[PDB]
Amino acid sequence: ANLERTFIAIKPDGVQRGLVGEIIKRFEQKGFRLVAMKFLRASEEHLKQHYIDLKDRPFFPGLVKYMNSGPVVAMVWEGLNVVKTGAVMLGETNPADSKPGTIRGDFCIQVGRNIIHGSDSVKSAEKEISLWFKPEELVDYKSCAHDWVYE
Amino acid sequence: ANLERTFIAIKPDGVQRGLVGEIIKRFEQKGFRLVAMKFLRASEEHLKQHYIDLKDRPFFPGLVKYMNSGPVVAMVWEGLNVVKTGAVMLGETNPADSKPGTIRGDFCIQVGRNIIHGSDSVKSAEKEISLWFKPEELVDYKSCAHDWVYE
Amino acid sequence: ANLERTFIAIKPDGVQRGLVGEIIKRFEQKGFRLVAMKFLRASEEHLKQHYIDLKDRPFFPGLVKYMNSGPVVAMVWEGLNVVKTGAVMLGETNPADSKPGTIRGDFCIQVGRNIIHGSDSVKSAEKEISLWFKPEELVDYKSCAHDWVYE
Amino acid sequence: ANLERTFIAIKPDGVQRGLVGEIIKRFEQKGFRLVAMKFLRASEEHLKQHYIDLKDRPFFPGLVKYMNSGPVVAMVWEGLNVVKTGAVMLGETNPADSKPGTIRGDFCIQVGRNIIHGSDSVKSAEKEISLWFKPEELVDYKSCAHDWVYE
Amino acid sequence: ANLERTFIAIKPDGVQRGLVGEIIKRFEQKGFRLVAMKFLRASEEHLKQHYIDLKDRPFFPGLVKYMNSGPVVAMVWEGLNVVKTGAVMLGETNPADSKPGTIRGDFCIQVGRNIIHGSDSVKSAEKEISLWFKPEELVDYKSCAHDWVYE
Amino acid sequence: ANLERTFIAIKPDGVQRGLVGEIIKRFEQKGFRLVAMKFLRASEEHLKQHYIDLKDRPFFPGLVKYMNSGPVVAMVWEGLNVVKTGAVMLGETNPADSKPGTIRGDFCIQVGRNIIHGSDSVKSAEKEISLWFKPEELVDYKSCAHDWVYE
């Protein structure tokens, strides 16, 4: 009954390279419902919170600097298995392993410029939704094609 | 030689979700030849015959009712290995497993609303072609690009 | 006036050149409803009835020859002002006078190879629909997006 | 000149019909800079402020109704003559007068379901921007391709 | 008449902004025949020859500097009225005046960064083809779809 | 490393079937840099050198015949791991094994009409580049988006 949500952020390279519309189209055409969306330059402290699990990695400062180097598009999407399916659609974390047809497979080359983030679990998703969105920014509506996407 | 043919049907949800053009385009761009095509609401009797091998399964009444709940686009496509290759282009029957780049992978979420049918064997293909089309609704012509698609 | 219908045929060149999906997509995305569709080689006799107002013109033989030279995709589309708007979408009769973004403007060059026909008036649409389709081939269903296309 | 901004809102019909990505791609590909974006159900109050110059009009309570009937994507885009040019890109107010190639020409049919709003003048834009966005929601960054879009 | 040629050049901003595939696709989809294509950084001397008519204009040095500032894609396309029709497809010289659906209307903003050049007459085309291409770089072949593009 | 180059040739079938723009777009959008491009009918003598290793095979004559039967688009592309990644983008040598989302998977059917060639190694690539291009045909410039594709 198809209420799972995931957090997806188009990274500053995705914005800079003019991919926002293309990426959103992929999620819309698949049948997922856009729940929330905002555009911002994320603060350093916010990004450190987001990537708290990577804080002791040598690449972490560079990741935070890159993730703050331009605006991101932050989104929440709803649908059956949106967490795992969203991850499939994005492609492997490293664009190198990413297959053609996927977002990273189609559009990027290096892991440190891999255009998009998607939650890696339901638990991570709910943390990330809380971090990036106030509850009232999550919009409840019913898609007109819902009964053709779901039995 | 006379090339292999497959039966492709765009299901009520694929029509409803506005994917008819997108789907046909993928077959045309691959180099397959459209042999036949019609748009209809398949009667429950016609669907009972299409799914006759499933007449004793518990889901059969619901399947037939669903498949009768909107029009389908019924098609025959020709080409080398079109049955197997068409099936790959459609993706796995469960969209949860279908890869980005495939029809079901790109455009749908749940197996009960999986937008499209393709024949699963040459046997099944000929069965399906004979059921859904009169032999005179199958058009013979040579694609202008045939000698660039086939040696 | 939202039940108006037009007759659209993809001409033999439009089929040969692989434009069936593209064409259908433009009608779907606009919000029009597909009512009927089939794929056939129209007989010379059928085409003489379609072009009956022109039977005494010198270009008649060549017109019927062209329209019979391969299969066409015959369609009925429904919506508010679909006749006039559909015509605008197609472009002008001469592709050279058809603007970029129209079907003829984007996809063909010469008036005698102008890929697509659309009815020129409601009167001609009603005539053409009857000629090419039996009433039982016209499917009645409601678009899930209807209430977002129409007030 | 180059720092002009306009207010673009994708109406509830454009969201419902899966056109958000499509619309953003058009502005991206043109060379305009996205300054702000958010997704929200606009309150009846907010909408009455936005349409305050029609309070005393027949069509007001149902307009405010439609515009509150689903979420909208509110955006601020920057560029030379973006107000006038954005308007041309959207098409005419009535989709029936909107040329193929424009957003309304391509995607919708009826004036009460015309998918998108754009500012009608520079003064209107600065009014709309200040109504719909906090100043801190407007992001200042430089497009990597700026020097290839502008002398 | 179907053997007319035109010179089309993607300017350095069109290459930088990743529009080469898109542009070529528009010409291919129209039915025109690619006759010659090369990628180069045009020399200052070459450019001064190309713009010989404007050699006494104040802006000529800056124009040559721009046009030398990155590579261009130089092309020759063949077809009926391709000089005039190519021009239409590109849009007006000033992207402010170019309509949605045209190359310039869809993809650029400022006249100085107007992404593409096409010949303005048969005489200009022949001059430009002689300047930019060696005779042996124009390739003779017949499109497989020629009889479907031309009567 | 980031300055690796590969050789990509769009075979005569790829040109004939109007896939030049589509192919180039896939490389552009990935973030690879176009270094060199020309369009020619490769002579039997040139193709004999290109396939020199296969000169004693029974299929060699028909291979050369095919590859000389129309023009090709020869390209050099640059970027990190572009040889291997380019290969993945193209799909397997046999279109039957090529996944949807790949060039051969999406656009062709038979191994002997498989639309495109890419280098199979760095060694091969440099050999092919020397054969197909003069060194002065390889253009040095920096992509405006370089710093958003690469760390």
Q: Under an 8 A CB cutoff, do F30 and A110 touch?
A: no
Q: Nearest CA to CA, how far is D1 from chain A (Å)? A: 22
Q: Are B13 and B113 in contact, with CB atoms under 8 Å apart?
A: yes
State the greatest distance between any 2 C-alpha atoms of chain E, in Å, as a whole number.
Answer: 49
Q: What is the rounded distance in angstroms from the CA atom of residue E73 to the CA atom of residue F38?
A: 10
Give the residue from chain B lying closest to F67, CA to CA: B148
The residue type of E19 is L
- CB neighbours of residue A18 within 10 Å: 23
Let me know: does F21 contact E22? Beta carbons within 8 Å.
Answer: yes
> Which amino acid, one-letter code, is at D121?
S
The minimum CA-CA distance between A25 and chain B, rounded to whole Å, is 10
Give the integer Cα–Cα distance in Å for B67 and B44. Answer: 8
CA neighbours closer than 13 Å in the CB half-sphere of residue A93: 4
* Residue in A46, A50, A117, A146 annotated catalytic: A117
Residue with tokens 């389908």: B72
HSE-CB of C18 using CA atoms within 13 angstroms: 25
Given the structure tokens 């259908």, which residue do they identify? C24
Q: CATH: 2.30.42.10, 3.30.70.141, 1.20.1560.10, 2.160.20.70. Which one for A1-151?
A: 3.30.70.141
CA quadruple B132, B134, B137, B140: dihedral sign: positive
B57, exposed or middle or buried, with CB in 10 Å at 0-12, 13-18, 19+?
exposed
Q: What residue type is F57 in one-letter code?
A: R
Task: State which amino acid sits at residue D6.
Answer: T
Contact C107 E145 (CB under 8 A): no
Contact (Cβ atoms closer than 8 angstroms) between residue F78 and residue F4 = yes
- Asked whether the beta carbons of E79 and E14 are under 8 A apart, the reply is no
Nearest-Å Rg of the Cα atoms of chain D is 15
Restricting to F residues 47-106, those with a Cβ less than 8 Å away from any Cβ of E are 70-71, 73
For residue E118, the cross-strand partners are E8
- Contacts by E131-136 with C-beta closer than 8 Å and gap 24+? E131/E46, E131/E49, E131/E50, E132/E7, E132/E9, E132/E46, E132/E50, E132/E74, E133/E36, E133/E38, E133/E74, E133/E76
Nearest to B22 among C18, C21, C145 (CB): C21
Query: Under an 8 A CB cutoff, do C81 and D99 touch?
Result: no
Chains touching chain D through at least 3 C-beta pairs below 8 angstroms are: A, C, E, F
Helices A20-30, D20-30: inter-axial angle, 10-degree rounding: 160
SS3 per residue for chain E: CCCCEEEEEECHHHHHCCCHHHHHHHHHHHCCEEEEEEEECCCHHHHHHHCHHHCCCCCHHHHHHHHCCCCEEEEEEECCCHHHHHHHHHCCCCHHHCCECEHHHHHCCCHHHCCEEECCCHHHHHHHHHHHCCHHHCCCCCCCCHHHHCC
**Phi, psi of F88, deg, nearest 5:** -70, -40
CA dist list (Å): C11 to B39, C33, C54, C124, E146: 18, 20, 18, 17, 15
Chain A residues with CB inside 8 Å of D145's CB? 18
E150: closest CA of chain C, how far (Å): 6
Q: Tokens 């936005």 — which residue? A: D50
Residues of chain E with C-beta less than 8 angstroms from the C-beta of D31: 17, 107-109
The angstrom resolution of this structure is 1.7
Method by which the model was determined: X-ray
Active site residue F146: no
CB spacing of D31 vs E109 below 8 angstroms: yes
Cα separation of D18 and C146, whole Å? 14
Residues F41-50: contacts with CB under 8 Å, at least 24 apart: F41/E139, F41/E141, F41/F68, F41/F70, F41/F71, F41/F72, F42/F67, F42/F68, F42/F72, F43/F68, F44/F68, F46/F131, F49/F131, F50/F128, F50/F131, F50/F132
**Helix (H/G/I), strand (E/B), else coil: F106:** helix
* Residue boundaries of the structural domains of chain B: 1-151
Query: Rounded to an integer, what distance in angstroms lies between the CA atom of residue A128 and that of residue A132?
Result: 6
**How far is CA E125 from each of CA C5, C109, E8, E73, E142, rounded to the nearest angstrom?**
45, 19, 9, 16, 21
